[PDB]
From Swiss-Prot, chain A:
Role this protein plays: CRISPR (clustered regularly interspaced short palindromic repeat) is an adaptive immune system that provides protection against mobile genetic elements (viruses, transposable elements and conjugative plasmids). CRISPR clusters contain sequences complementary to antecedent mobile elements and target invading nucleic acids. CRISPR clusters are transcribed and processed into CRISPR RNA (crRNA). Cas3 and Cascade participate in CRISPR interference, the third stage of CRISPR immunity (Potential). Absolutely required for crRNA production or stability.
Superkingdom of the organism of origin: Bacteria
Classification via Pfam families: Cas_Csy2
Gene Ontology BP term (one): defense response to virus
Annotated keywords: Antiviral defense
Name of the gene encoding the protein in the UniProt record: csy2
Listed InterPro entries: CRISPR-assoc_prot_Csy2 (IPR013398)
The protein's name: CRISPR-associated protein Csy2
Family: Belongs to the CRISPR-associated Csy2 family.
Protein species of origin: Pseudomonas aeruginosa (strain UCBPP-PA14)
From Swiss-Prot, chain B:
Protein name in the entry: CRISPR-associated protein Csy1
Source organism (scientific name): Pseudomonas aeruginosa (strain UCBPP-PA14)
Parent sequence residues shown: 11 to 109 of 434
Segments for region (Disordered): 66-87
Other observations noted: In this bacteria, Y.pestis-subtype CRISPRs do not confer resistance to phage DMS3 or MP22, but instead are required for DMS3 infection-dependent inhibition of biofilm formation and possibly motility.
Role, per record: CRISPR (clustered regularly interspaced short palindromic repeat) is an adaptive immune system that provides protection against mobile genetic elements (viruses, transposable elements and conjugative plasmids). CRISPR clusters contain sequences complementary to antecedent mobile elements and target invading nucleic acids. CRISPR clusters are transcribed and processed into CRISPR RNA (crRNA). Cas3 and Cascade participate in CRISPR interference, the third stage of CRISPR immunity (Potential). Involved in crRNA production or stability.
Curated annotation (Swiss-Prot), chains C, D:
GO biological process terms held by the UniProt record: defense response to virus
Source organism (scientific name): Pseudomonas aeruginosa (strain UCBPP-PA14)
Cytoplasm keyword on record: no
Function of the protein: CRISPR (clustered regularly interspaced short palindromic repeat) is an adaptive immune system that provides protection against mobile genetic elements (viruses, transposable elements and conjugative plasmids). CRISPR clusters contain sequences complementary to antecedent mobile elements and target invading nucleic acids. CRISPR clusters are transcribed and processed into CRISPR RNA (crRNA). Cas3 and Cascade participate in CRISPR interference, the third stage of CRISPR immunity (Potential). Involved in crRNA production or stability.
This protein's name: CRISPR-associated protein Csy3
Keyword Cell membrane attached: no
Domain of life according to the entry: Bacteria
A matching Pfam family: Cas_Csy3
Length: 305, 99, 333, 333
DNA sequence: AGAAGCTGCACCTTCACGGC
């Protein structure tokens, strides 16, 4: 029932110190949970004034530059840290390792509400952009397009606003604006499929996803096995350690009016497609899935295949 | 009885490891180091020494280590949704951290 | 009564990374076709100039080591031989909503903190604080090592209103010193703009571009990256510089610490100079941490003496408290 | 009072990568658009000149001494055949404020070190140090192998004030020797200007040009690049000359080594000449390290006697210690 | 002459090698 009637395209945002740490097993690109939380914060700050809902968001990542370095002699890479000030007496404090990365990603998000008939044509998108300029995306300050040779505008396309040839024409003119990027997709049916082809009288713990992340150059009577697209591991939500507690129960929460729960990360498989083989741009959007008395605080891209 | 010599060997191993890297010549610290860390008052002080929790999936200490929060030993329930999986929980049994 | 157990404050006055281009002086008008300075890797040969540890060694191998050379490979950023001007450019977002805590447990503590910052901005708004921030934008303090040998430096600041410029400022950064905070007209206009962007009304975007007359072919300093050097030969190179989009730049936190050093109120000889605004006010240069909680002048004791025991500090120390509130941090018990 | 665990000193007397062009003598005045010397990669046929190893000591494989043209690949830098003058040009900032470290831990040690440097500079200023620096700038010691066979070497030093000269010196570099610091009126004026730049009383950026008559189409020697790559052959050049933008150049640390040779005070036989100033004063090309720690005349023991124990050394060792502080580096526990 | 908070000190503790 979460179906958009519009698609507000926010253009190629640049992000200067993101969270290159994504999860206790995965690093690199930030979590899609960050993008769903950014769109939910935008709906908390903008969308209630326009009586519109903002659910679902795409990711293109026009460029990525992590702040890492190769230790001179090893095959792995270490993170370029930051320097914290001294503690209380004059002494170098204990360093925590924060992974930071420069991102450049445009995102299209699905407008849902009754606050558009024909009056907010391109001022609703201007309002959303000029309010999201004063916000951060994954811990990274969105650099709001300084004085340069060109500007970069926003867009608002309606699915009912146009007939079928105009629907595919507007889809084509939308996907020309984000064509060098790479669309991120949750792929869970592919993970379960590769599991049940892997699971031939042998069990698993987490190797179903680690075997698709790696680059095996094994031999079969050297050869190397191929994977379709960049099948990466991504943190796809949380799972319940604890039964959820009342607001006046847990010491040192963020606030004493929300129930708190202790959660673990959950792990799934994502793909970086190009956005010219999506076959419907009304897909490719990241939604939440609570089921909150079970756990399973997941985010995904449903309705895909 | 049958395991007394095992714990006496471990206590003597800790005692020799303490006495080796002392760099001592004077002040006679070995008398106290053989009074405490050799006899069965070491087990009394070990039962006095607390702090352990024997975690499985919850270590608050990687998140900014000067943080006296709560740590859990509760492995989570299996997700009913087909697809994704985590927690090393459907086979190949795992060791328990202690904080 | 009791303070908030979780108390967070986001970074207002958020700058961006300060890209470095190179060009001739008096060509600052057409300073958009200027090429950027690229970091290079060069291998150097030097001596064993560090002091030795004559513990579990022998004298023959150590004096044979100090007789023998020492090969390293560092990173360096030079100006070209046709460019005696460094152009350091960055953007700066003044966010707005200064005293609002981004996380707070107790509703009573949140109400008392909001009333305290409300009475502060009612009786003494962001005049002196924004004047000190406008000084530290106006004198080129974000050139850390790039300022000490400059003949002349000039700071151009442009307010970007919608998608284009609205106000242009042009300052001489050597007349405005690094230790004094005078009162001029254009500095007060920039401070009023910063205060309007800090009073919750707007989220002001400025561009700052600083021209520095260093010399032909001289060496500039982008901010050095921190690698902890605990492992297999990850410290053989000993110097790595920061590079974004194939261009040398300074980190965001270094520019923030550079325009943040406004505090001329600490109990240890405040005629020395302004230091960075930190809780238990620390300088990493002298290796000291001023305002220790043995004296009653740290940020924490001044904070829960202001908003909890209802006793206001001196007029200069509540400026420091609100400067920590703009600075942002994680506090609470 | 003890030595701080981190002590970093920033480079005063900062040179640039000295570029090399080639032209004709008596056209030294209009030597602005002189064509640059390029590095040419050539392949040479040679012989086996190295002494034989124990594996090549076989009677069958001493054929490598007999027929093996040895086929090496080197770089070269030559003048044009109608051009008998090498011009080497660079710039040099001298900053000042020598005794202030850019990183410290003990503020008491920092204050004691600033007190010792202050009582030095008000006891005896930078007169002997800047005199020896101006003498090493006078004779073209930065022309390292480009000086040993040159017929006449002439240097021109221009005090670039804003974009033009403010005072120009012109020295015959061969008349001023490489082993004794004599006196001259223009040399005392340049020494006083370098001393005024060394005390923070002015901004001093000099442009140093040096012409040398090597010969018509002879070979000039730029800096050779260090390639930190170990054992491999048949494709390794083992001689890579340094060049910036297809123009042969000398390294900046090479010039910094050459105008630092002011140390005529070391407890060994000083009848040879000045060596460079390093802690445990080393010439690794000669294989000997003067001021060994078995003598009490290295930089660290003299420094920790001057600062910690208040045992002031002789005035020459004071000049050596302050020359090391002008050099810079990492000192500390 | 008894209560709270601060500081000083002790206690724990080392690796396996060559680009879809």
């Amino acid at each position: 029932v979460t179906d958009p009637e519009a698609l507000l395209l926010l253009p190629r945002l640049s992000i200067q110190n993101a969270n290159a740490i994504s999860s206790p097993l995965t690093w690199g690109f930030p979590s899609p949970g960050a993008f769903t939380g950014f769109v939910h914060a935008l709906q908390r700050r903008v969308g209630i004034s326009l009586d519109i809902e903002l659910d679902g968001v795409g990711i293109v990542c026009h460029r990525f530059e992590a702040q890492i370095s190769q230790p001179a002699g090893k095959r792995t890479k270490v993170f370029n840290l930051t320097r914290n000030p001294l503690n209380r007496d004059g002494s170098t404090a204990a360093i925590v390792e924060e992974g930071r990365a420069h991102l450049e990603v445009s995102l299209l998000l699905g407008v849902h509400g009754d606050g558009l008939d024909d009056h907010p044509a391109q001022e609703i998108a201007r309002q959303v952009q000029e309010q999201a300029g004063a916000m951060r995306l994954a811990g990274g300050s969105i650099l709001p397009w300084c004085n340069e040779r060109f500007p970069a505008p926003n867009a608002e396309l309606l699915m009912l606003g146009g007939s079928d040839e105009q629907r595919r024409k507007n889809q084509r003119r939308l996907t020309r604006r984000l064509l060098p990027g790479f669309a991120l997709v949750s792929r869970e049916a592919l993970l379960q499929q590769h599991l049940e082809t892997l699971r031939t009288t042998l069990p698993e713990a987490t190797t179903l996803d680690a075997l698709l992340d790696l680059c095996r150059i094994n031999f079969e009577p050297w050869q190397v096995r191929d994977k379709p697209g960049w099948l990466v591991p991504i943190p796809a939500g949380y799972n319940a350690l604890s039964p959820l507690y009342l607001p006046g129960e847990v010491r040192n929460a963020r606030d004493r009016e929300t129930p708190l729960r202790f959660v673990e990360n959950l792990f799934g498989l994502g793909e970086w497609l190009s956005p010219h083989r999506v076959a419907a741009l009304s897909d490719l959007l990241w939604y939440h899935h609570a089921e909150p008395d079970k756990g399973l605080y997941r985010w995904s891209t449903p309705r895909f295949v | 009885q049958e395991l007394r010599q095992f714990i006496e060997s471990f206590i003597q191993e800790r005692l020799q490891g303490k006495l080796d890297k002392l760099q001592p010549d004077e002040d006679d610290k070995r008398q106290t180091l053989l009074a405490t860390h050799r006899r069965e008052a070491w087990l009394a002080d070990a039962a006095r020494r607390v702090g352990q929790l024997q975690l499985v999936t919850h270590t608050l200490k990687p998140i900014h280590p000067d943080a006296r929060g709560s740590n859990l030993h509760s492995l989570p329930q299996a997700p009913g949704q087909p697809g994704l999986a985590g927690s090393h929980e459907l086979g190949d049994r795992l060791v328990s951290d202690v904080v | 009564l009791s303070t908030a157990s979780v108390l967070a404050f986001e970074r207002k006055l958020d700058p961006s990374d300060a890209l470095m281009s190179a060009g001739a002086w008096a060509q600052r008008d057409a300073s958009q076709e200027w090429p950027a300075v690229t970091v290079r890797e060069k291998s150097v040969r030097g001596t064993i100039s560090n002091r030795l540890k004559t513990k579990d060694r022998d004298p023959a191998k150590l004096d044979a080591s100090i007789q023998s050379p020492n090969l390293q490979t560092v990173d360096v950023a030079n100006l070209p031989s046709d460019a005696d001007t460094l152009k350091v450019r960055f953007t700066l977002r003044v966010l707005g909503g200064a005293g609002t805590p981004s996380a707070c447990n107790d509703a009573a503590y949140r109400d008392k903190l909001l009333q305290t910052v409300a009475t502060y901005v009612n009786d003494q708004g962001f005049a002196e604080l924004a004047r000190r921030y406008a000084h530290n934008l106006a004198n080129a303090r974000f050139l850390w090592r790039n300022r000490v040998g400059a003949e002349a430096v000039e700071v151009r600041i442009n307010h970007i209103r919608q998608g284009e410029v609205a106000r242009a400022w042009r300052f001489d950064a050597l007349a405005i010193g690094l230790r004094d905070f005078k009162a001029d007209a254009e500095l007060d206009a920039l401070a009023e703009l910063i205060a309007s962007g800090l009073s919750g009304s707007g989220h002001v975007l400025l561009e700052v571009v600083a021209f520095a007359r260093i010399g032909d072919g001289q060496e500039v300093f982008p901010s050095q990256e921190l690698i902890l050097d605990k492992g297999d030969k990850k410290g053989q190179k000993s110097k790595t510089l920061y590079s974004v989009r194939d261009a040398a730049a300074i980190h965001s936190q270094k520019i923030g610490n550079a325009l943040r050093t406004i505090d001329t109120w600490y109990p240890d000889e405040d005629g020395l100079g302004p230091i960075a605004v930190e809780p238990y006010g620390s300088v990493t240069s002298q290796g000291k941490a001023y305002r220790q909680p043995k004296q009653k002048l740290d940020f924490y004791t001044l904070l829960d003496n202001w908003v909890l025991r209802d006793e206001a500090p001196a007029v200069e120390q509540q400026h420091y408290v609100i400067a920590n509130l703009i600075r942002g941090g994680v506090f609470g018990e």
